[PDB]
Amino acid sequence: VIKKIALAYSGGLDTSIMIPWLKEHYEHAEVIAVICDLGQQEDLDAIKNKALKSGASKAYVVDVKNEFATQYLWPLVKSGALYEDQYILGTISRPLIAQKLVEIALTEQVNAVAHGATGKGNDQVRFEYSIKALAPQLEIIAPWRTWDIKSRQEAIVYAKAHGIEVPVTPKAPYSRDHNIWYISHEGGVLEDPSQEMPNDVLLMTAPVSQTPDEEEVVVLDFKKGVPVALNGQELSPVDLLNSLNQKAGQHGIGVADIVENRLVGMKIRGIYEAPAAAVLYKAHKLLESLCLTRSTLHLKQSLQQTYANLVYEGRWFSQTKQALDAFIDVTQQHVTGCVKLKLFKGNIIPAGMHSPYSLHHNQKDAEGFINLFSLSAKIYSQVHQGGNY
Amino acid sequence: VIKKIALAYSGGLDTSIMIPWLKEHYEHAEVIAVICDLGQQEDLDAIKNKALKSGASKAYVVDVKNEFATQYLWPLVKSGALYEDQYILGTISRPLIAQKLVEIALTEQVNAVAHGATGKGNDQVRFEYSIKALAPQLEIIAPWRTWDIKSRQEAIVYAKAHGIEVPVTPKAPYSRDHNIWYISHEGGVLEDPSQEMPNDVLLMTAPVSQTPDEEEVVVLDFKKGVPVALNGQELSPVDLLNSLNQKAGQHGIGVADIVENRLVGMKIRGIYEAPAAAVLYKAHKLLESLCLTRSTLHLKQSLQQTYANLVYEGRWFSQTKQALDAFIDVTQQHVTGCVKLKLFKGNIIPAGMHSPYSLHHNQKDAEGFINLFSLSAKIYSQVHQGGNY
Amino acid sequence: VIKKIALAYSGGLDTSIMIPWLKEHYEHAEVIAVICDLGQQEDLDAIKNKALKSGASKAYVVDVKNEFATQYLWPLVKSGALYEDQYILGTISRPLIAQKLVEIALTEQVNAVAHGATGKGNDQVRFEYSIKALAPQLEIIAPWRTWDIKSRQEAIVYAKAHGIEVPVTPKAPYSRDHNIWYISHEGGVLEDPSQEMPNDVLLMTAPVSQTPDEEEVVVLDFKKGVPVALNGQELSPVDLLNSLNQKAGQHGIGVADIVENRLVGMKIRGIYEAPAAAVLYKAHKLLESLCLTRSTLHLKQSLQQTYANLVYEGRWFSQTKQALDAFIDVTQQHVTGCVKLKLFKGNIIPAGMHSPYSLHHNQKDAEGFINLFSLSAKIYSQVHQGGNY
Amino acid sequence: VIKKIALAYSGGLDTSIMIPWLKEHYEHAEVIAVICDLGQQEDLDAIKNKALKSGASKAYVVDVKNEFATQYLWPLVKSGALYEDQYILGTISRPLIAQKLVEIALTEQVNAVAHGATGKGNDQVRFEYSIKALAPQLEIIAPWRTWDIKSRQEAIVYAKAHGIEVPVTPKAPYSRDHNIWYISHEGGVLEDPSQEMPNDVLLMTAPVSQTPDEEEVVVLDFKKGVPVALNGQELSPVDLLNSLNQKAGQHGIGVADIVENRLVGMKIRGIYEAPAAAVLYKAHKLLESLCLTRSTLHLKQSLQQTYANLVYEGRWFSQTKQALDAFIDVTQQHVTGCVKLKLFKGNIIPAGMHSPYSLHHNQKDAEGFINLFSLSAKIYSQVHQGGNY
Q1: Which of A99, A151, A337, C270 has the lowest CB atom count within 10 Å?
Q2: Residue of A nearest to B377 (CA)
Q3: Where does L-citrulline bind (chains A, B, C, D)?
Q4: How far is Cα D140 from Cα D113, in angstroms, rounded to an integer?
């Protein structure tokens, strides 16, 4: 019998009404709320209190910002992966949320876990793949796939009948996800790809026309593929991301307006802000061009899409991911050095780089190489004498 | 016996002195100069007269700008290829130069062809692969690999001794290549990747600090993957490239400061200007995200590197390339529509797109998909109970 | 209101009882049976008559052996694809069955189509993906996913109560699929991979221990990647497949005992017979090794898996497949020549090959090629002085 | 100055006359001979004595069979790599020979190393890539690229004039390479792919017609992707290879007659015997089909070609190979179990397998998966109404 349920709790109206909903559809069930700090810059104590006031017996707040950076964002930087060559993969946070949920579930000996992902997007897949990979014995409850609530107004009606406070402010005009790595904006007038990005979307990035008229120099030190210092100051991953997000955001850097293919459904138009991510991706690419051999670089670049698809689809916890990580970690052993960049009006402008492991340093040799490199073409053309290309 | 030689002639000092050198090292050999207009914006009449003055019996001048755009740049645009995810592949001009050299060689009954590529770069490979692929029976002469001339100073001594005009004008600070698609800058202080780009490199692209304070809207119409109209005006490929190069260059767009792996040698640091190419690449990528299925998009993106490497290495005239083109052409059948872009201070900002072939338009279905998509992960975790990722 | 239903009809118990089931669950609905000849070597007039006896208003028998060979098997031979490097892809018949069902559906102006695939295998995916690709407006009815019949014995009870002949013949020990390309055997004791293949599985391939003691020479002529003659006799595709299946089957060739990953579900063990396929695949691989450049061969081999997965998953009718076919077709332009093979006790033994397009025909060149090919390795080893591999 | 040279010494006439040749072209140079036992089953004492009699100051004989099996063949087995899907990569011995040569050279204070690979094949590249990767400071001498000896008779003339014994028996009709993993046969009448393999080629494999009339069962136990026991008996890698080569060779297993693309040159026809390799590859492929997830299997199979090309080209000692190895080692963690095989008349017949990590063990779920899996095709077909595939 289901006596205890752990709920991944966002503090929004949806997951708040899920608490009484769970307690009514699973008679006499206790609900434990799990709240993750990933950098959404919300009042987590207020969210904790709302969980308790909504009927949760316990409400955990776990600060996972450093673990997000070191265990997820740093492997992502090392991979250089961009989904469909465009999307910065901020939904990499979903496996971590699932992992904290399962960890507390097992510590609290709950009979089931629940999440608030809707029945329409990829997020439900990302959560439930991760839960099954970490704890295949745990029952999963997805109230959006079971209940009769279909609109916000219907959720409001339910909240009133079940003692749940309805916030005064409306949900944003756009559906948003926010962590230390990115901010996403979807829905509303954004669903029409024929329409330009409205001027009220951006939250952490200055519009390019409102950026300083003087460039800003940043110097990034990397060790084994990840940044360890900014402007000569060693900083924790979170402090470095925070500082670079502010600096690059002030200079308007990193906004992506893209259409991407979902796994679940068709296509989605979104706006994605990630100033620090764009700067780190640029610096990392620069250093790899100096420190990797041609064959290593080419093989690694050919695996980036595989890595991006895996992360995008929520397959973080899989042996396939572990094997890619092992490959990537070897390629990163010498990606160590210094990159200077100028930030200016939405541009990340290279301003020099160096590495102790830089690989950058006869005429008769060339002729021999040419003759053998082109021998196949010569034989083919002799065989197909007079043929066209 | 070598009675006739066709030379790919640029009008520079090197290929100018090759004319008397060829005539002296092959007694009673006649030298035919071949001059291609690829958009280098030089005085072609002067180059022709200089070839004849230097001792060429004939000097062909061929305007190949439309052939370059329609037979090389348009397939490149359709491919979406960027070498090592950075380089716009302006050396795609080398197979076309070789193609015209061979076409004229064969109508002139020449015994050998010559080119002025140095013994150190990739260009000798690109030229000679193409010549062997198109005319394996033609002997190739590369005087940079043969003669006793070692320095530019030595080439000047030789030129004076043979009546070749050498005006006092200092050595260019950078080695440059220029066609309708791009400008490359290499050598000199650019060789050191720790050194920022000097402020005298750029020739067709405004530094971002001097770009207009008002954005410029461009509207591009594509048909089957290639642009056919700009701002509602149907334009030839050459006119469209010229117009877009001017507009995007004024707004500072398209400069790449990169380190790449050579085929012959190690790494090279270069600055590349390609304003129209950057805009076309952006618009093409946007339209592909709207018009291709996920499976077609992912497969095509996985072949971009193969195509880029093939173009970079000079393997244009190969059955491998023909097979890639046939693949790409199918994927481009519906890449038709309109992309609006804002050009502003080095940025290409999406401003809306639409296509008659846009692919952008249940809760129980999702649950079934989730369960089968995650089934392997569930089984794997049950088998490896207690294991980590 | 559903007035007409087209059903893909095999004559087996399942699709036989689907006729009365459909007629009872869609009142006043007429059922049109569609029977395809793919080489299953059954009495199709008997199947036709049985559909009519069970209440079908029309029963089509479509002879698609020729088109199966030239439109499906010939592209497959040209691709060289084997699913997971093992499986000969006999389920390539499913899109063709769906295609014929849809053509008749459209002609007869039916309101829905039906197929008899179970709710457990990949086949339901292959059928329904194809129907959606060809006729997105047609409703699909899958009785296995709807009716109250759970077991074969329940199906038998249902048949007797609806006038359908079920004579006493025992349950087949294996589930089988048979067409001109292959025979599959699955289920029963084959489900356990720790159990060797029982001695009563094979139907068209002799056990190796009873094969002739004298080898048999076969000579295959290929044109543009497909076989056109056998032992100097030009034969239609179906005649050549029939003859080669007989000859190679007599000599015990082509049995695969394999475990494969499904798309829907986990893993499946099956026995697959395909004697002619194995011989054609061998001859095709030999001719490619003679006629393709290294770069073309390597790229095509890299795409075999993509092609195999696409065919395996039922994605035949897709732009992705069209683009792959255009690639493959270029690579096959010169795969033309003669291959002699000795068939002997399960072995396909090369006995010589030749082609008018065969590509098979200095010390100073080698030194130059070696030095440039190994230059990156030398530089890397100097930078990482003393490091290990 | 070059006072001391280490020579990779095979005992043949070529490397024997290289000893006086080296001493004459490098005045007063000492020559150290290095002889590797890789399983070529020759009289190594006679070879050592011939080296000393030919003028070597020292002749090292090193038994490297276990090092070859554990550090080269076992990684190859784990990779599953077959060059161009055909060639078993017995030239994997070349990096090991180069490794021993360099190891001894650095203990003997030699200034240069020499090898006897000819100026025509891939072997020179394999040797010299490895030497540069392991010891870029060592000068390399390849007498076949420098001396004036062009024929066997010219080598005999030189040997007579320089005190080198000429063997009574001729060189074999075929050029051969032999180690514990394989035997290769090339040259002679084998250069003609239209000609069947002659009946005097095979050395360790029975002709299929001369194999036992009763099958032989073998049972292989694998741990982490490599075999550890045969027929229930734990065996060292060398003993297991020796025993399996004998058993499978007696049953005629493992002969490949192929045409492959060289790196250096065009195409080469060879005969390759590797009985144990074929059996190990089969068993390994079987266990991977049981123990890996679909996504891991497909990704690993996509990297086999990259691995095969790397090995074939002699790039063993590279960071690219190290990164692949790290990938592979993760995938092999659970490739542990038992494979029973029947050996019979050239066939390797599966006879059951099991693993403690085997991954082999609803109707509403399937319908949801089908609808979402095929949604893209449905949307595409609605957009392109009336279009063909």
Answers
A1: A151
A2: A133
A3: 87, 122, 126, 175, 184, 260, 272
A4: 5
SS3 of B324-353: HHHHHHHHCCCCCEEEEEEEECCEEEEEEE
Contact assessment for residue A335 and residue A111, using Cβ atoms and an 8 Å cutoff: no
Q: Alpha helices of chain C — where are they, by DSSP H?
A: 13-25, 44-53, 65-68, 74-79, 93-108, 123-134, 152-160, 237-250, 275-291, 294-312, 319-331, 363-373, 375-383
Rounded CA-CA distance A264/A121 in Å is 6
Both tokens of D116, joined, read 């006897």
The HSE-up count of residue C334 (CA atoms within 13 Å, CB side) is 22
Nearest-angstrom CA–CA distance, B56 and B49: 10
Can C94 be counted among the known catalytic residues? yes
Q: Does C364 touch chain A (CB under 8 A)?
A: yes
**Distance between CA B233 and CA A229 in Å, rounded?**
51
C-beta separation of A3 from A28 below 8 A: yes
**CB C33 within 8 Å of CB C51:** yes
Instruction: Based on DSSP, count helices (H) and strands (E) in chain A, helices before strands.
Output: 13, 14
The experimental method is X-ray
Task: Tell me how far apart the alpha carbons of residues D20 and B385 are, in angstroms, rounded to a whole number.
Answer: 66
B13 is in an annotated binding site: yes
Minimal Cβ distance to D364: which of B359, B368, B376: B368
Is C145 annotated as belonging to a binding site? Answer: no
Interchain contact, D361 vs B379, CB within 8 Å: yes
Out of C37, C54, C93, C94, which one is annotated catalytic? C94
D144 touches chain A (CB under 8 A): no
Q: How far apart are CA D264 and CA A376, in angstroms?
A: 10
Cα(C259)–Cα(D375) distance, integer angstroms: 29
Q: Compute CA B124 distance to the chain's CA centroid, rounded to the nearest angstrom.
A: 15
d(Cα A73, Cα A75) in Å, to the nearest integer?
Answer: 6
**Amino acid identity, residue D38?**
L
What is the rounded distance in angstroms from the CA atom of residue C2 to the CA atom of residue C30?
9
Find the closest chain A residue to B253 by CA distance. Answer: A347
Do D330 and A318 lie within an 8 Å CB cutoff?
Answer: no
* Number of Cβ atoms within 10 Å of the Cβ of D37: 17
Nearest residue in chain B measured CA to CA from A215: B209
Count CA atoms within 13 Å of residue D377 on its CB side: 29
- Using an 8 Å CB-CB cutoff, list chain A residues near B363: 119, 144-145
Cβ pair B198, B189 in contact under 8 A: yes
H helix runs in A162-293, sequence order = 237-250, 275-291
Helix ranges, D235-338 (H): 237-250, 275-291, 294-312, 319-331
In angstroms, what is the resolution? 2.0
D386 assigned binding-site residue: no
Torsion-angle region of residue D276: left (phi > 0), alpha (psi -120 to 50) or beta?
A: alpha
Question: Can you tell me the distance from the alpha carbon of A14 to that of A10, in angstroms, rounded to the nearest whole number?
Answer: 9
Q: How far apart are CA C78 and CA C303, in angstroms?
A: 12
Strand order in the sheet with A216-223: A233-234, A226-230, A216-223, A337-344, A347-354
User: Which helix (H) or strand (E) covers residue C350, if one does?
Assistant: strand C347-354
Backbone angles phi, psi at A348, to 5 degrees: -110, 105
Cα C389 from chain centroid (whole Å): 44
Residues comprising chain C, all counted:
389
As given in the structure block, the two tokens for residue C124 are 């339901």
Distance CA B342, CA C163 (A): 72
Note whether A292 and A331 are within 8 A (CB): yes
Distance, in Å, from the CA atom of D51 to the CA atom of D48, rounded to the nearest integer, reads 5
- DSSP code, position B293: -
Interface check for C266 against chain B (CB to CB < 8 A): the answer is yes
